[PDB]
Amino acid sequence: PTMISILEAIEPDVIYAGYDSTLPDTTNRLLSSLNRLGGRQMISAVKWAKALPGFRNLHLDDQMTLLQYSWMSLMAFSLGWRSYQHTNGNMLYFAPDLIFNEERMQQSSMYELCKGMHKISLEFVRLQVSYEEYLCMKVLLLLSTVPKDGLKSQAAFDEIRMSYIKELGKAIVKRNWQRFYQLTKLLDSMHDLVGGLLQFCFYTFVESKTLSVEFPEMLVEIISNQLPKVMAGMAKPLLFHQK
Ligand SMILES: C[C@]12CC[C@H]3[C@@H](CCC4=CC(=O)CC[C@@]43C)[C@@H]1CC[C@@H]2C(=O)CO
């Protein structure tokens, strides 16, 4: 089987938030639901990541570190893709039972960040990103935020990352350098957006009582590790372009 076949085969099914739409929206309900969904998606992401060629050969500590650093990037990018594929206009397709319009983006109290995530879908539109390109790009996001002090299997990581860069190149050819330049530019743009998402995430995590935002155990585990590392500057982006 081809590398791209495996990527297609291991791509998770769509996840539901478990939202009751008969009950009115509130800020707390929306954010807590977003978090419950985030937690479910991350359980699936762990499963997905563990099945990735090459990546599955890294020491397990490296596997969980990369997933932990890249969590927000992966989910924002997948959101962008879902919103492109299943929706049109200013709408975010978080889940089949949790779709945001202008109202819901406003009431979430993270309106500007919703618009930032929406920009990803607009870029998928403009560039006409193929499914195969998207699958390759998503893996690159898993491999694009690393601890500043390095990984256990650094040389192996570099090799794995290069192979998926080559995979992206194959996805491009199927259908050149200009497209590579453009798609890697889109990857780089995730870092600034994710910075904004993380600022708000940490705020809601800390202010959760006074606000009243619920987080699942899955996200509590991630955030309690990521809050200190990100705030302490331990995460380094691996950029394709000059900053
Ligand atoms: C973490 C977060 C709720 C969960 C989402 C995240 C943005 C990206 C994202 C995409 C999804 O498809 C599932 C939810 C999620 C992971 C939001 C950024 C701010 C927001 C909060 O801080 C709510 O407390």
Numbering used by the authors: -1 to 173, 180 to 247
Report text from the authors:
The glucocorticoid and mineralocorticoid receptors (GR and MR) are paralogous hormone-regulated transcription factors that have served as useful models for studying protein evolution. GR and MR have a modular domain structure that includes a well-conserved DNA-binding domain (DBD) and a moderately conserved ligand-binding domain (LBD) – which binds the hormone, changes conformation, and attracts coactivator proteins that potentiate transcription of nearby target genes; they also contain poorly conserved hinge and N-terminal domains. The two paralogs descend by duplication from a single ancestral corticosteroid receptor (AncCR), which existed in an ancient jawed vertebrate ∼450 million years ago, before the divergence of bony vertebrates from cartilaginous fishes. We first resurrected the LBD of AncGR1 – the GR protein present in the common ancestor of bony and cartilaginous vertebrates and the earliest node after the GR-MR split – and then used functional assays, X-ray crystallography, site-directed mutagenesis, and computational predictions of biophysical parameters to dissect the mechanisms by which GR evolved.
